[PDB]
């Protein structure tokens, strides 16, 4: 998620 690797990541 630090790379916004999935659209469900909080913050992305």
Swiss-Prot record:
Disulphide bridges: 1-9, 4-12
Superkingdom of origin: Bacteria
Subcellular compartments: Secreted
Family to which the UniProt record says this protein belongs: Belongs to the heat-stable enterotoxin family.
Summary of the function given for this chain in its UniProt record: Toxin which activates the particulate form of guanylate cyclase and increases cyclic GMP levels within the host intestinal epithelial cells.
Name the record gives this protein: Heat-stable enterotoxin ST-IA/ST-P
Residue range from the parent sequence: 60 to 71 of 72
């Amino acid at each position: 998620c630090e790379l916004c690797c999935n659209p469900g990541c909080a913050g992305c």
